Design a binder for this molecule. Sequence first.
Ligand SMILES: Cc1cn([C@H]2C[C@H](O)[C@@H](COP(=O)(O)O)O2)c(=O)[nH]c1=O
Ligand SMILES: [Mg+2]
Ligand SMILES: [Mg+2]
Ligand code: NA
Length: 433
Amino acid sequence: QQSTFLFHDYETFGTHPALDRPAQFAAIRTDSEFNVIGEPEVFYCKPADDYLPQPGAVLITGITPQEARAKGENEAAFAARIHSLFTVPKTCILGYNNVRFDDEVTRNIFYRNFYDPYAWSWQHDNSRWDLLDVMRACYALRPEGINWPENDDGLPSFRLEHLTKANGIEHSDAMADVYATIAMAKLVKTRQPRLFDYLFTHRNKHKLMALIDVPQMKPLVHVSGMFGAWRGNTSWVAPLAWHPENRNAVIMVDLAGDISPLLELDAVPVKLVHINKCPVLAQANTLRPEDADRLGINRQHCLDNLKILRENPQVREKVDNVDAQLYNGFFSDADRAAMKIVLETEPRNLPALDITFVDKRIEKLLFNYRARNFPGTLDYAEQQRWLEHRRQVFTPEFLQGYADELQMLVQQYADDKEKVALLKALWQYADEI
Ligand SMILES: Cc1cn([C@H]2C[C@H](O)[C@@H](COP(=O)(O)O)O2)c(=O)[nH]c1=O
Ligand SMILES: [Mg+2]
Ligand SMILES: [Mg+2]
Ligand code: NA
């Protein structure tokens, strides 16, 4: 009814958004002015017994598999709680690195648990945003008034913890990262008000499409992590064409690159810009001469490449584990309707549910869903199928490797008492599972 922001963040058991499992979700809702209006939403996800967490992830988060299992609900119920927060009308769902990471975790949790992986983002006036590329855009285009820390390599850092410390934001508990993300939003809104407004409005794919002039190859500023911190994640780009299959993807040339292989053949300075993924795009003059110089971006090289590309328009023409299979395709309307019945049927009425799916992923999705979330509902043949599944995960190579990694880390981090205790926990859990 009113426009709100839902700030959120996952802690996970590893960095693969499909093949690792979530540990904890944290979120809070604000009004359109970033005033907190909701209660903190913090909860855990019970990991199924076909999985061991990445030791490195647990050393970072401090959340053991024992803790998520004892404090969590099954992933079906975890997914339900997240889906009910995300689908409140007129919600902008945002975080810090959510476009690349947390949103991929969400898509995969929804996929595995019979929710639509995509609808949450856009239905009922919803949107997404991400403060990471907002911070990157400020550094590159409007750095005044913010402290920009360097990492140990002498490159600008966009780690949330570095930006908060550098700008006097308290950081810190479970909610610390979510509150830090709200503080970043307020920082940019205060210190770069017009840029903040511009970036917020341009989260919308139609505002982004208005910038794109393919016939003219109209140059734009693009701020992207792919460009690299050494050039402030920034270049001038030109649109060449739209993707043959992906409706949301435009094919850009990086004008700072070497266009020789693109001109001559039948590094390639070509990238996809996904207009549904909050890319930072603006008119060319948004990168001011002083900032182009600061970032080492060569205007004349970019313009020379642009001139060549415009004179050569032939360039436009030139350019298994079911858990890993989200992007194998969109489901049919019938299959989506069938999966909605799975979702909305009681888990006790699921064994008796006779329903047809055509997409070949759904049989395996359904078996995993029932065995992971509702193991008490499995019959004997299903129990034996699950035992085989666990065996095929816990291969001789995998189990040896896991033990080896723990034994290496406990020696490596011998003097870190908190890490030693976490490694003990990881061994204990692996021994059980
Ligand atoms: C920063 C970092 C995160 N992670 C995992 C655990 C975190 O819950 C998850 C998200 O962390 P982040 O949002 O700080 O990037 O990624 C690692 O496995 N290794 C790492 O070095
Ligand atoms: Mg995070
Ligand atoms: Mg954290
Ligand atoms: Na956290």
